[PDB]
Structure 1
């Protein structure tokens, strides 16, 4: 219970709080370019290089839709995004910082370019840090995909997120609730908890969410403890 909360008369149920209104040039009410250049840089593994070398022009055109300048440096092994004078959206650089990172973690460009949309969010979760043994790490990482990918499919339908497992990372793209659930499932899966328990928990949560009378009270007696 939070005490010392003041009343909020302006808050009513009519406002859709989660809608994202479009940002345009007229929305930037200062009317001036960004004061100084903002840049984000990442490194990528060496096996991605040639793929990046093929797709970079396409990547450039995508950022040309948002006035973001991109630089690939194969000698350094780095990808850089930066704002220009033509840039008017303050957030669109951060999404650019996501995109190259998604490109660094084996997410394909047609999937990764959707991070430029407003409703899309991404998470890159490190899985190589939990356990030091190689065989245990391989087994727990394969538990995420499962046999014939079905467990992975069971994740992607439940959290509504595109999930790609590569190396020491898992890259998830979707809504924020789905990202939260994916992070929980992945971090528990690296801690020797099988994903099927979380899958069953999400099923029970999904069926309880349909019933309106069950919203106020606790779901703990329905949920099997694991």
Structure 2
């Protein structure tokens, strides 16, 4: 069949090579030719004929996107199941000033991290912002509202009230 290939960052190939043993041992059994082309600086996976399901090509494409997002590859490539969604949202195309981008990133991080990741934990998302993109993994129902709130926090408005509204919506979800 065809193949899915994408280039990765400088530290992504060093991070992925530490977990490339069990990843390739499961991908080749699932008909995915997961190899790291260090000469070309890219990771590719070819769909072979040793797959018992057609979702292996879709799961390897999501795993390659999770591996190239400079996130934890072993904690983000286990979304091969149906009720496990991992995606990356590029928030770098939201601001122009570097000081405004740094101020928005501090608001997105929150006070000591947990002040803004509490709503991410309430929405059950393993959110990790790396550069201009933020990758989160979890249930699709919990991450759809989380990514919409992340897009609202990525806007030019202050995300302090959005984080407070997200905690209010999480508190109102108990009913």
TM-score by length of 2: 0.88
> Could you give the per-residue CA deviations for residues 181-210 of structure 1, whole angstroms, max 9, x where no partner exists?
222222222212333323332333344444
Tell me the distance in 2 between the aligned counterparts of 1:154 and 1:99: 26
Tell me the distance in 2 between the aligned counterparts of 1:185 and 1:207: 15
> Could you give the per-residue CA deviations for residues 204-225 of structure 1, whole angstroms, max 9, x where no partner exists?
3344444xxxxxxxxxxxxxxx
What SS does the aligned partner of 2:5 have? strand
1:118 aligns with 2:82: yes
Tell me, yes or no, if the aligned pair for 1:137 and 1:190 is still in contact at 8 Å: no
**Distance 1:126-1:46 versus aligned 2 partners, 3 A rule:** same
Cα shift at 1:96: 0.8
Bigger Rg over Cα: 1
The structure showing larger relative contact order (alpha-carbon pairs under 8 Å, at least 6 residues apart) is 2
1:105 aligns with 2:69: yes
> Could you give the per-residue CA deviations for residues 86-107 of structure 1, whole angstroms, max 9, x where no partner exists?
1121122111111121111122
Query: Gapped runs of 5+ residues in structure 2?
Result: none
What SS does the aligned partner of 1:112 have? coil
* Cα RMSD (Å): 1.9
Tell me, yes or no, if the aligned pair for 2:119 and 2:167 is still in contact at 8 Å: no
**Distance 1:48-1:98 versus aligned 2 partners, 3 A rule:** same
**Distance 1:125-1:141 versus aligned 2 partners, 3 A rule:** same
Q: Residue 117 of structure 2 is aligned with which of 136, 153, 157?
A: 153
Stretches (4+) displaced over 2 A: 52-55, 64-67, 192-210
Tell me, yes or no, if the aligned pair for 1:81 and 1:96 is still in contact at 8 Å: yes
Cα shift at 1:65: 4.6
